DNA sequence: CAAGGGGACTCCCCCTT
DNA sequence: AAGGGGGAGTCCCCTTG
């Protein structure tokens, strides 16, 4: 069961909106916010130790998106942080919640990746033999690095919180179970981010369809994009906008013809939803309302 | 025109649509077309020697956009061309026209600009002293390069045709006047492309204006773009679209409200033009028609 | 391949406060 | 400067023939 002391993520990071920064760009470009942040009501990743009150140390580090949680080529930078990418905070005996309001992600160069990665692999399995390392092991350490650089997603990271309860000594030597956050996408990384409908020229139509709408959106590859018109309650009607890739303008607009509603001769207007859908994927835009009107 | 023999550009290069290629990208990415090219009917830069029939040699090279024509950091690459960027063709005594259907522009790196530059300058003022060069002159040769690299536009080039009449010897040793073409813009270079109206949602209105139009365009700068609605008669009637920069969507759409026509209570619809205008500049889109209708 | 095109990786900036 | 953002280089790739 839960019974023993455990860490819990009180407020997860934003899965979508964060830009990873390269070494060149700067260290002061803004902190990884919470999933609940708004331009004014800002929130930061928070975690809490439950089933214990007292002095404690929580540390965060970047791990892979892969279930087997291996350390990431990327490093966390900030006021609280080590050079190895490890951020450490102290919870007072009163307040067992730790906020991380200044977390940045240093984006490793593909020319950098292996050296930066063996450095980490060293630091990590050098306490396993603290005097030195064998060439045999250093050959095989480079072997992990290589096989990891071939599969490693540099667009997606996960925060890993490792909580440590300070003992009687003064030593923060007791471990808790490590808690991994949900994935974090690089917003300035290849597409597949948050589909957005900025505005559309019409929000209404006849039940017949064929009415041409100009839809302004965030970047949508002609390849992977549709215009899904659906009702959710009513056993899920679904139909699509009538557009050729030529009709998707510089990946920021769609000129499409509305589809007909499933049931003609409706006595009165029927409100439906439309949304962007990646057919290749399954992601969706924030859906807007559309009204279908009756005939003559 | 000069009585003596002279070159004339029969068909100029396309001022607008050509991409300059970097060394990495490839050598086979398409030839600099004529100002008259279409996707069916393709045309290439052509020049002719007039006021002479016989064997002759025409060579093309890239010169600065600056009126005093200096050799450009960029080089011409192709089937006909030298490593120094100089393309050479031979006109037989019958046909005194030279077509250049395979001209590419190698785009120099900013890290390689000075070296590539001193190389064409050595080549150029090494025939002025063909045994060697003085360090003093090589100090001052580097001085030309430096002062040129400060002011050189790497987005704009001009073709320079140098025609040479073969003499009795067999030597193509007689010069004609060199003819410089109109400027050639890098299409994949910063801003300053052709304002284009892709499509608009409405082409019509009431004389009253205030009708909202969604216009899809090529990239425009939010601050320094406008929507000029004008009548061709030098009466000048001109007015503008109504929109905030917020209304210019990801620089590829404009949502604006039509202006009122100058003269209300017309009894017949009046056709006007609208166009994009850079107010900062004076560059215009290809203008589309708009119809103003009467009231109630 | 030729003849086009489009879209990442690293970096370099600018507006706002 | 802290806390956002878009732009620009050079490159590394895709359409159709």
Residue numbers in the entry:
A (entry chain A), B (entry chain B): 34 to 329
What did the published study say regarding this structure?
Mammalian NF-κB is assembled combinatorially from five subunits, p50/NF-κB1, p52/NF-κB2, RelA/p65, c-Rel, and RelB, into homo- and heterodimers which bind to specific DNA sequences, known as κB site or κB DNA. The DD alone mediates protein homo- and heterodimerization; the NTD and DD together are responsible for DNA binding; and the NLS region is flexible in solution and together with the DD forms the binding sites for the inhibitor of NF-κB (IκB) proteins. The mammalian NF-κB p52:p52 homodimer together with its cofactor Bcl3 activates transcription of κB sites with a central G/C base pair (bp), while it is inactive toward κB sites with a central A/T bp. The p50 and p52 subunits bind to a 5 bp half-site (5′-GGGNN-3′), while the RelA and c-Rel subunits prefer a 4 bp half-site (5′-NNCC-3′).
